Amino acid sequence: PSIIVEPHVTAVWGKNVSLKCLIEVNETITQISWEKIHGKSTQTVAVHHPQYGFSVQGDYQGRVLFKNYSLNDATITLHNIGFSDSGKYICKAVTFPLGNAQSSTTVTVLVEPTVSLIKGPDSLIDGGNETVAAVCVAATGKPVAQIDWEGDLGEMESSTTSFPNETATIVSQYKLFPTRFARGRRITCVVKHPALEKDIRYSFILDIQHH
């Protein structure tokens, strides 16, 4: 309506997110609140009342700040984000005399992957058969990270395991036939994920041996 909110929002596990709400009703504001859908019932996250002040409820206590004291600005920030913070929220303005108005914001919780780049277990002998030259892991991210490789020296093979909390670990091995042409060149693991401000990039120089 005149309840201005962002319709869809992502939140990174263990960081902060802002639940924006501007109230332009041109009406007398009785109180304003954020609520969370639970079945058909809703549960209160935070309340502002012009005489009774703020209130934060449930497991949100200690993790919710009201941006400012204006009754027309219902924006809050949520902190120490966890999986249960996902779902549909309602910003609500109760007004006098016409009553309530609202708009919804759905929150998706993302988890940053833990990335590591490791060398293959076997040494890369020139003229030898296909060997795993490196292994890139992006562990327990939500959703699963994406892994790409730079340096066209071979081919990629990956597996993914998803977990009850809906994070996923992806393991990607880079396979190549060692040659003279590949010696001294650099292979890069590139991990893309929506919780990342920029792609994680790890690389190292190929060591190709003698005989």
Ligand X SMILES: *[C@@H]1O[C@H](CO)[C@@H](O[C@@H]2O[C@H](CO)[C@@H](O[C@@H]3O[C@H](CO)[C@@H](O)[C@H](O)[C@@H]3O)[C@H](O)[C@H]2NC(C)=O)[C@H](O)[C@H]1NC(C)=O
Contact positions vs a copy of itself (CB under 8 A): 28, 30-31, 33, 35, 42, 44, 47, 49, 51-52, 55, 57, 92, 94, 96-100
59 counts as binding ligand X under rule CB under 6 A: no
Separation of alpha carbons 29 and 134, rounded Å: 61
Could you say which of ligand X, a copy of itself, none residue 36 binds, taking C-beta under 5 to 8 angstroms by partner kind? none
163 counts as binding ligand X under rule CB under 6 A: yes
Mapped onto helix, strand or coil, the DSSP state of residue 103 is: strand
Residue 13 or residue 60: which is nearer to ligand X going by CB?
13
Residues 132/121, Cβ–Cβ less than 8 Å: yes
Separation of alpha carbons 94 and 31, rounded Å: 5
167 counts as binding ligand X under rule CB under 6 A: yes
Could you say which of a copy of itself, ligand X, none residue 105 binds, taking C-beta under 5 to 8 angstroms by partner kind? none
Residue 69 or residue 96: which is nearer to a copy of itself going by CB?
96
Provide the H-helix boundaries in the chain.
none
Residue of minimal Cβ distance to ligand X:
165
Per the DSSP assignment, residues forming a β-bridge with 22 are: 4, 73
139 counts as binding ligand X under rule CB under 6 A: yes
Buried b (16+ CB within 10 A) or exposed e, 38-72: eeeebebbbbbeeeeeebbbeebeebbebeeeeee
15 counts as binding ligand X under rule CB under 6 A: no
Binding interface with ligand X (CB under 6 A): 13, 111, 139-140, 163, 165, 167, 169
